[PDB]
Structure formats: structure tokens, C-alpha cells
Amino acid sequence: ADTIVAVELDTYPNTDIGDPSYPHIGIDIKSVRSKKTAKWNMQNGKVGTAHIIYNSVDKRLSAVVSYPNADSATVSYDVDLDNVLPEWVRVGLSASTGLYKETNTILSWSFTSKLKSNSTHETNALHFMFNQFSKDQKDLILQGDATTGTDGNLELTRVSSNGSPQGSSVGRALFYAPVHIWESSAVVASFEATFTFLIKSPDSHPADGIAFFISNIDSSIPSGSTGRLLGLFPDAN
Amino acid sequence: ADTIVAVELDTYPNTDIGDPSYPHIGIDIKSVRSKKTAKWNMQNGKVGTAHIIYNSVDKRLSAVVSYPNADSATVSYDVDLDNVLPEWVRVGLSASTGLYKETNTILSWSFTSKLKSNSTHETNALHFMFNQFSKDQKDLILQGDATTGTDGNLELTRVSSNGSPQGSSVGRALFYAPVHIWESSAVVASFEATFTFLIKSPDSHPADGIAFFISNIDSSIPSGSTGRLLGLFPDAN
Amino acid sequence: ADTIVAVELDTYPNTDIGDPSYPHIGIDIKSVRSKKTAKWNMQNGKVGTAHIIYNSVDKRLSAVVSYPNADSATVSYDVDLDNVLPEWVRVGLSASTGLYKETNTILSWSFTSKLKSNSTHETNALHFMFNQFSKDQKDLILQGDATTGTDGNLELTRVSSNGSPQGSSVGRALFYAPVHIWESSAVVASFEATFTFLIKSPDSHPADGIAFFISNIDSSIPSGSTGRLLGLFPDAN
Amino acid sequence: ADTIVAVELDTYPNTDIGDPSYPHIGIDIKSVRSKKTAKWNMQNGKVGTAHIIYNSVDKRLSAVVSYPNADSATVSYDVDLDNVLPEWVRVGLSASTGLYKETNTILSWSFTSKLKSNSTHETNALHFMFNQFSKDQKDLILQGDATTGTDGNLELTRVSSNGSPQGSSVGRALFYAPVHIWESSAVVASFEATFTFLIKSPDSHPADGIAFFISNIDSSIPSGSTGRLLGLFPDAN
Numbered sequence: 001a002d003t004i005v006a007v008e009l010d011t012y013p014n015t016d017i018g019d020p021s022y023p024h025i026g027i028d029i030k031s032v033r034s035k036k037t038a039k040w041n042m043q044n045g046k047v048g049t050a051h052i053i054y055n056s057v058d059k060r061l062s063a064v065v066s067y068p069n070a071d072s073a074t075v076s077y078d079v080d081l082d083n084v085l086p087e088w089v090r091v092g093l094s095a096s097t098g099l100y101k102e103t104n105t106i107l108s109w110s111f112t113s114k115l116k117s118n119s120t121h122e123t124n125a126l127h128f129m130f131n132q133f134s135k136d137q138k139d140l141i142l143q144g145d146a147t148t149g150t151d152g153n154l155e156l157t158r159v160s161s162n163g164s165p166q167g168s169s170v171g172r173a174l175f176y177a178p179v180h181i182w183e184s185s186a187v188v189a190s191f192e193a194t195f196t197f198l199i200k201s202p203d204s205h206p207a208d209g210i211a212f213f214i215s216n217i218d219s220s221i222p223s224g225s226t227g228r229l230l231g232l233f234p235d236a237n
Numbered sequence: 238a239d240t241i242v243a244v245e246l247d248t249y250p251n252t253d254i255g256d257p258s259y260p261h262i263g264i265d266i267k268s269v270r271s272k273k274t275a276k277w278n279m280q281n282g283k284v285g286t287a288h289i290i291y292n293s294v295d296k297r298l299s300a301v302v303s304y305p306n307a308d309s310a311t312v313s314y315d316v317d318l319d320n321v322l323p324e325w326v327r328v329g330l331s332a333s334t335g336l337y338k339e340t341n342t343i344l345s346w347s348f349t350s351k352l353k354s355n356s357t358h359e360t361n362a363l364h365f366m367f368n369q370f371s372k373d374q375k376d377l378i379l380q381g382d383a384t385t386g387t388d389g390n391l392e393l394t395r396v397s398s399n400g401s402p403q404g405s406s407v408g409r410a411l412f413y414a415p416v417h418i419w420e421s422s423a424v425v426a427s428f429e430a431t432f433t434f435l436i437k438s439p440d441s442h443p444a445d446g447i448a449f450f451i452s453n454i455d456s457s458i459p460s461g462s463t464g465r466l467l468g469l470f471p472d473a474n
Numbered sequence: 475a476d477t478i479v480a481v482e483l484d485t486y487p488n489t490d491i492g493d494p495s496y497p498h499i500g501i502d503i504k505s506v507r508s509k510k511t512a513k514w515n516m517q518n519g520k521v522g523t524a525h526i527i528y529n530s531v532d533k534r535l536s537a538v539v540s541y542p543n544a545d546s547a548t549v550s551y552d553v554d555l556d557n558v559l560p561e562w563v564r565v566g567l568s569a570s571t572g573l574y575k576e577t578n579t580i581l582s583w584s585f586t587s588k589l590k591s592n593s594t595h596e597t598n599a600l601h602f603m604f605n606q607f608s609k610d611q612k613d614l615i616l617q618g619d620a621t622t623g624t625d626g627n628l629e630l631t632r633v634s635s636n637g638s639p640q641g642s643s644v645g646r647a648l649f650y651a652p653v654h655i656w657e658s659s660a661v662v663a664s665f666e667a668t669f670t671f672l673i674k675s676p677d678s679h680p681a682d683g684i685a686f687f688i689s690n691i692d693s694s695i696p697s698g699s700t701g702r703l704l705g706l707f708p709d710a711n
Numbered sequence: 712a713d714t715i716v717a718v719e720l721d722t723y724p725n726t727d728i729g730d731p732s733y734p735h736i737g738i739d740i741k742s743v744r745s746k747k748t749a750k751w752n753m754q755n756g757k758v759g760t761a762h763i764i765y766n767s768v769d770k771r772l773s774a775v776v777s778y779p780n781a782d783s784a785t786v787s788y789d790v791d792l793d794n795v796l797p798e799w800v801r802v803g804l805s806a807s808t809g810l811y812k813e814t815n816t817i818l819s820w821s822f823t824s825k826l827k828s829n830s831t832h833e834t835n836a837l838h839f840m841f842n843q844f845s846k847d848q849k850d851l852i853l854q855g856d857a858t859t860g861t862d863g864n865l866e867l868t869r870v871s872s873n874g875s876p877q878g879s880s881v882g883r884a885l886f887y888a889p890v891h892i893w894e895s896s897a898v899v900a901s902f903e904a905t906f907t908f909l910i911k912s913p914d915s916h917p918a919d920g921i922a923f924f925i926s927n928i929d930s931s932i933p934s935g936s937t938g939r940l941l942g943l944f945p946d947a948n
């Protein structure tokens with residue numbers, strides 16, 4: 001049903017569905033089998049940052065993930081999103097846990113979308129920046145187990161009172177207003193997203209990951225999308 | 238019902254309800270009887286620009302209206318919006334015509350809302366910029382007679398095919414996502430809005446005006462709000 | 475000689491020159507005797523944030539200083555900077571120590587200056603953001619004892635190798651490009667500055683303070699401006 | 712001497728030095744012989760817009776030129792600017808005329824430069840926007856025949872009183888503050904430039920072109936760089 005384009009931060013290697021033998025970042029185009037991946041030296045307990053960029057001139061969706069005092073991981077993929085996604089979309093964050101677990105804490109999230117026309121000084125733009133999430137965040141659509149306000153953070157997956165991450169959990173957060181990614185007169189369309197996250201787990205093999213995604217406006221969590229499916233895909237096809 | 242705060246560009250003087258004997262700009266706080274006004278040298282057929290600013294430190298809502306090659310009109314009013322508006326609001330543009338008419342064309346509209354916390358580097362923000370409106374503008378809620386797409390413009394009030402403005406019309410456009418104007422930890426909240434408009438009428442006494450407003454999220458056009466009520470207030474009390 | 479407008483974070487009370495009997499924030503207009511002050515609950519060793527705003531409509535220069543988990547201090551002063559400062563200025567940060575000392579560490583510094591004309595869509599702007607200072611920061615003019623690069627920070631005053639603040643020190647940092655604060659066709663001019671700082675001292679009565687200032691482009695540190703004069707004024711008149 | 716990277720809007724085809732047989736846009740890397748070009752349907756007398764983008768992840772310098780109501784021209788080139796340009800540079804606009812002439816009027820110019828570190832929330836940025844140039848633009852370095860203020864525009868090349876473009880002219884405008892395009896801890900560096908221009912000539916074969924360029928900070932107009940050399944290169948090698 002849903003049309004998904006996502007940049008996944010996959011913490012658990014499911015070699016059976018294509019994942020390499022280590023934590024990695026990937027670019028999914030309508031499938032959990034990333035069309036491109038890169039080795040990601042994930043750090044349990046540290047706060048990392050993910051930057052995602054794209055422009056209609058280059059037609060290259062790229063993402064860079066980093067941790068303070070460490071080398072970053074980068075992954076690019078040539079794709080024309082006008083040929084994949086509809087005109088109006090909704091952007092969001094998703095995460096899941098399965099038998100193995102982890103906290104999927106989002107500490108901040110910014111996003112910028114620009115459509116420049118052939119007309120003189122004619123730019124349309126949308127930009128949001130969340131550095132503090134409140135208990136009643138009305139400009140966010142929360143699905144599944146996602147909640148706001150706990151320490152001013154976004155918890156994508158269920159976390160108990162003592163701070164322990166629960167398993168078999170799945171949650172997503174989408175910005176309220178639909179975003180316009182294509183125009184008829186647009187000479188250049190672009191977008192950039194940034195978000196800091198904290199993945200913490202008492203386990204040695206944490207699972208499953210966090211993903212920034214772009215889907216159709218009426219997108220909802222597919223049934224049985226916990227675990228390796230990251231709350232984005234209905235199956236591993 | 239609705240809580241309204243608005244900056245009106247009133248083209249028709251209704252001396253009976255408090256309006257001075259000339260076109261003017263005013264600041265309305267829950268009443269059509271502006272709590273403050275300034276003489277506005279309106280120009281039929283020219284494109285003007287309105288800038289609206291406010292910050293929680295100064296607690297002063299100010300607006301400046303200008304036309305190219307002309308002196309501007311300015312009006313300020315000391316008001317603490319935390320004591321007037323709820324935490325979550327929706328911003329928008331409204332216009333109306335009555336026996337006398339005019340076109341209420343919006344050529345562009347930008348808005349910025351910032352909430353800075355006492356935390357280090359903790360800003361929440363929302364910013365939108367419409368320089369080109371399309372026929373299916375999904376991130377706008379259109380009410381009454383407002384329509385998009387005609388020449389890439391927003392027509393707040395009904396306009397016929399030949400370009401002639403209709404009377405007894407009323408329309409509003411609100412940004413889709415609710416805006417957060419107050420926090421508990423906020424040390425400074427601010428917002429600024431800018432919009433260009435074209436008021437054209439074949440009449441010598443055009444009516445009624447355009448208004449940028451901020452209301453509760455479920456705000457709708459009150460019954461019989463055409464004419465002097467600007468599509469904002471149910472009565473002239 | 476120099477024309478100075480400054481927002482001072484005064485840590486040492488010099489009751490003899492007008493300072494109240496406690497640490498405070500003040501607004502100086504060509505004199506060290508603040509034309510307006512507010513009690514500031516300074517915290518030794520904590521990182522604080524100062525926000526400074528001004529717009530030509532309100533003609534009110536305001537500043538808010540805060541620390542995480544604490545109430546903020548605010549101070550405003552009605553002043554028309556067009557009547558005080560020249561058309562072109564340079565913005566900067568200054569600090570000093572005297573018999574009593576403190577570190578005057580600047581961890582970040584952003585600044586935005588806007589001039590909006592009566593012309594349609596005619597904004598001139600300058601915006602810089604320093605979150606990391608390098609050893610050779612070419613877009614900054616360093617005067618006195620100010621240095622960059624140490625831990626990616628700006629040290630306005632001299633600090634020894636072991637991290638200890640030296641006395642009788644004075645340093646300033648100015649952005650390289652002159653800023654334009656007034657136009658002939660401007661309908662609204664505004665600026666906002668933000669900077670995080672760390673004041674640390676082994677003493678119980680730290681001195682002297684940090685100040686964000688705006689002066690004429692060829693401004694230099696006046697002789698004997700260490701101590702209470704904050705590196706801004708030649709005398710206490 | 713000078714290290715130049717430029718995006719040229721070449722109006723006159725000098726087939727002898729590599730230029731195709733028509734007006735075109737090109738990307739020059741230390742040579743007037745563009746390493747990549749695209750057909751440009753130049754329009755005498757119309758105002759066009761040029762957008763230039765680049766990011767250190769993609770390592771692709773792209774430019775899109777357009778006119779209202781027309782299809783745009785685009786050209787990309789894979790190049791790592793860290794391997795071509797020094798750490799600190801100056802950005803600018805240049806133009807020239809020779810036997811054949813044209814006006815090289817710049818109506819607006821914006822530029823954004825960002826350096827994001829691996830540190831949490833650590834962005835350095837510079838952004839300037841000129842929509843109105845004044846007679847004494849202190850934040851611009853003008854070289855050759857470039858002048859400001861005439862109708863609030865930047866005239867890169869000499870124009871007489873009656874509005875007629877002169878030949879054998881050459882002028883450049885550089886932003887005052889040096890820009891930082893590379894860091895040691897940077898995970899992503901990017902920049903985008905936009906400028907509107909008006910090329911008008913009474914001739915059927917106008918010459919020579921306008922170029923947005925990035926060079927070393929002490930860059931000056933090379934001798935005999937009028938005509939086909941665009942005020943950027945000393946020779947056509």
C-alpha cells in the first residue's frame with residue numbers, strides 16, 4: 001500500500017534478508033532490502049547525529065551518520081524521487097525492537113524542504129526544528145508506541161519507568177503538515193533532514209534500528225512491522 | 238467562541254463602529270474595534286507589503302505596511318499574547334467584501350515562529366514561505382470563498398473570470414500545522430509574518446479589508462461575518 | 475573616540491561608578507554607567523546563554539540571560555540606534571579581568587541583521603553562526619588577549635595552560651565584515667545576537683564581565699580599559 | 712597565481728578556445744576551457760536567475776540557469792573542491808565585455824556556506840543576501856569597473872549615463888569576509904549561491920559573460936583579462 005523511501009540506521013544484522021554481517025546505514029526504496037548500505041560503527045549509549053540531503057539537480061539521496069570524536073559513515077544512492085514518491089508527502093521517524101531491544105530516543109529533529117521556480121525570486125519552503133518535545137506535541141502525528149515529553153525527548157519505542165527498553169515495540173512520528181516535494185515550474189527541489197538519537201541497550205546485540213522516512217500522507221504502521229521491518233514495510237520482499 | 242488577535246488592513250471606514258474617517262491599519266484583540274489604529278494611504282491597483290512582528294520580551298505587537306516608492310504606515314500595541322491566546326494556535330489570512338468590493342489577492346506569505354528555552358542551544362521553530370500557490374495547496378486550510386492557483390495567487394474573496402471582484406464575499410486561508418506560541422521553559426518567544434497583497438477595485442470606496450490573524454486551532458468563519466466584520470468576528474461588539 | 479552600544483554581563487559590583495551591589499546585566503549607550511540594569515544570578519562554572527534583540531519599529535534594545543534549570547534575567551531599554559550608531563558598524567564580544575579574575579570563554583556566537591525595504595521582496599541580510607572556533611579564524615578580528623582554537627572555544631581573556639584565568643587581561647573579537655544597520659528606504663531594520671559563555675573563577679568575587687557590543691568599524695581597545703571598563707570605554711564618565 | 716573555480720554564463724562563442732557554437736553555461740576549474748558545458752538559450756533584455764549548489768558528500772558542483780516562462784539549462788561536474796581550493800576563500804561575481812558588449816547587471820545575490828562537525832549540534836555558517844545595493848556597499852570589495860547604487864543595482868561592467876554598455880570593460884565584486892569551506896572535523900560542507908542578472912545589448916552577438924567564482928582571498932583581476940577571459944584567467948590555457 002504505502003510508498004516508502006527511507007534511510008535506515010540498522011543495528012541488528014539479519015543476513016537472511018540481505019543485511020551485511022554488522023550494524024549499517026542503508027537507503028531503502030520501497031523495500032527493506034536496502035538498495036545501498038555502508039558499515040556503521042554504532043556506539044551503545046552515545047548520542048549520534050544523522051544528516052540526510054537530496055536535490056533534484058544531482059538526484060542523489062545521501063546520508064552521513066556520526067558520533068562525537070569518531071569517524072563518520074556515509075552512503076549515497078542515485079535516485080530521482082519524482083519517479084518514486086507522489087507530489088505531496090509526509091516526513092517522519094520510525095523505530096522498532098523485536099526479541100532483541102534498544103531505546104530509540106530522538107533528542108532533536110530539523111527538516112527543510114525548498115522548491116525554487118523559474119520565476120524571479122520565487123521560493124516555496126517549509127522548515128521545522130524540534131530541540132524540545134513536549135507532552136502534547138500537536139504538530140506531530142504519533143503512531144504505535146511513540147510518545148513525547150519524557151525528559152523533553154521523543155521515544156519512538158516503548159521504554160519502562162526505570163529507563164529500560166521493551167521488546168516487540170514499534171512507533172513512528174510524522175510532521176503534521178504535508179510537504180510539497182515537486183512543482184510543475186520547479187527548476188530545483190531539495191530537502192535536508194537532521195536528527196540526534198540515543199540508542200541504549202543492556203544487550204550485546206541490540207535491535208532493530210531507527211529510520212527517517214518519506215511516505216504518502218495517509219501512511220500508517222503496517223501490521224506485524226515490529227523487528228526487522230522497522231515499522232516501515234509489511235514484508236521483507 | 239473563537240479567540241482572535243488580528244492586524245487589519247481596513248479599506249472602508251465604518252465610523253459607526255469606531256473606524257476613523259479613512260483607510261487604516263489596526264490591531265484587533267478579540268474585537269473588530271481596533272484597540273489601536275494608524276492612517277493608511279491605500280493605493281488601488283498597487284502591490285503592497287505588510288510585516289508583522291512580536292516578541293515575548295517586549296510584549297509589543299507591531300505591523301508596518303508599505304508600497305514601493307511611498308512612505309509606510311506603522312502601528313504598535315503593548316499586549317502579552319500569553320494572556321490572550323492559547324498555547325497552540327493556527328495563523329491565517331482573511332478578507333471580505335460587502336456592498337462595496339475589492340479583490341483580496343495574496344501574492345506571497347511567509348511566517349516564522351521561534352521558542353527559545355533556558356537550555357543550551359534549545360530552539361523550536363516553524364517557518365513557511367509561499368511565493369507560489371498551486372491549485373491543490375494541501376498545507377493550507379481554505380475556508381469560505383478562498384481559492385488557490387489562479388495565476389499562482391491566493392484569492393481570499395471571490396473574483397469572476399474577467400478579473401472583477403464580487404461583493405458579499407468572505408474567505409480565509411490557515412496554515413495546516415498548529416503553531417506553538419508558548420512553552421513552560423521558554424525564555425523568549427517570537428514570530429514574524431510577511432505578506433504581499435493586491436487590492437484592486439473598479440469602485441472609489443473599496444471594501445472591506447484583509448487581515449492577518451491568530452486564533453484557536455478549530456477556528457471557522459463566523460456566520461454573517463461578511464463586510465465590516467472581515468470574516469473574523471460574529472458581531473461588532 | 476569610539477561610539478559604543480553594549481549589553482554587559484557585569485560580574486563585579488563597582489558601586490562607586492553606579493553598579494548595583496550585585497552581579498547584573500546592563501545596557502550601555504556610550505558610557506560604562508548602564509542606562510538600565512537588572513539583577514543577574516550569575517553561576518560560577520555553569521554555561522549560560524545571552525539573547526539580544528532589537529527592531530527599528532519598537533526601538534527597544536532587550537537582552538535575556540539564562541542558565542539551564544534556572545529563571546532568567548531580562549532588561550530592556552527604549553533607544554533609537556539610528557540616532558546613536560553610524561550606518562555601518564562592526565559587532566563583537568569583549569571581556570576583561572582586573573585584580574579579581576575569571577575565564578571569559580565563548581562557546582558559540584550567532585548574529586542576524588536584516589534591512590527590509592519598501593520595495594516588493596527586498597531584504598538585505600547578514601547572518602553568521604560560530605559553534606566551533608578554529609586556531610586561524612580569518613573571519614574574526616581578534617584584539618588584545620583574545621585567542622581561538624583552545625578546545626574549539628574563543629577565550630576573550632588570557633587563560634594559562636592549566637586552565638587558570640589571569641588578571642589584568644582584556645580581549646575582544648569582532649566579525650570581519652562591517653554590518654549595515656540603516657538604509658534610506660528601510661521600513662524595518664532588526665538584529666538578534668545569541669552567545670553561550672562559561673565564566674569560571676577560583677575566586678568568590680569574580681571580575682569583570684563580558685559584553686556584546688556594536689561600534690564604529692575602526693574601533694579598537696581603549697588604553698587602560700582593563701577591569702571595570704570592560705575593554706569598551708576609556709574612562710568611567 | 713590565483714586559484715579559480717567558476718560557473719560561467721558565456722554569451723559569446725569563442726570556438727577557438729573550446730567554446731561550443733552557441734551561448735552556454737560552463738564549470739571552470741583553473742582554466743577558461745570549461746571542463747563541462749551546456750547549451751544556454753540566453754535572452755537579451757530579460758532578467759534571469761542562476762542557482763549554484765555543492766556539498767562535500769556528493770562532491771558535485773551543479774548550476775541551473777532559468778528565465779521566467781522558459782525551460783532551464785543545467786550543468787553538473789564531479790569535483791572535490793577540497794582538492795582544488797584552499798581552506799579559506801572569497802566568493803564573488805565577475806563579468807567582461809570586449810569588441811562586442813553587453814550590460815552585466817546584478818539585481819540580487821545570496822550565498823550560504825555551512826560546515827557541520829561530528830560534534831552534537833555543531834554548525835558554522837555564513838549567509839548574505841543583497842536585494843538592494845547602495846552607493847557605498849562596505850561589505851563588498853569592488854574591482855575593475857564594478858560599481859553599486861545605480862538604480863540599487865550592481866553593474867559589473869561599465870555602463871554610460873544613457874544606459875549603453877561599454878566595451879573592453881571588466882569588473883568584479885567579492886564579499887568582504889573570507890569564507891571557510893573546509894574544517895578538520897567537518898562531516899559535511901556545503902554552499903549554495905543564487906543571483907539574478909540582466910544582460911542587455913544593442914548588438915546581435917553580445918559578449919562576454921558573467922561568472923560566479925571562488926578564489927583565494929587575495930585574488931585580483933589578472934592583466935588583460937577583458938573579453939573572453941571573463942576577468943578570471945590571465946590566459947586561455
Ligand SMILES: [Ca+2]
Pocket residue numbers: 010011012013014019208228
Ligand atoms: Ca536489520
Ligand SMILES: [Ca+2]
Pocket residue numbers: 008010019024026032034
Ligand atoms: Ca538493513
Ligand SMILES: [Ca+2]
Pocket residue numbers: 247248249250251256445465
Ligand atoms: Ca472598516
Ligand SMILES: [Ca+2]
Pocket residue numbers: 245247256261263269271
Ligand atoms: Ca477598522
Ligand SMILES: [Ca+2]
Pocket residue numbers: 484485486487488493682702
Ligand atoms: Ca562592574
Ligand SMILES: [Ca+2]
Pocket residue numbers: 482484493498500506508
Ligand atoms: Ca555594570
Ligand SMILES: [Ca+2]
Pocket residue numbers: 721722723724725730919939
Ligand atoms: Ca566565450
Ligand SMILES: [Ca+2]
Pocket residue numbers: 719721730735737743745
Ligand atoms: Ca565558455
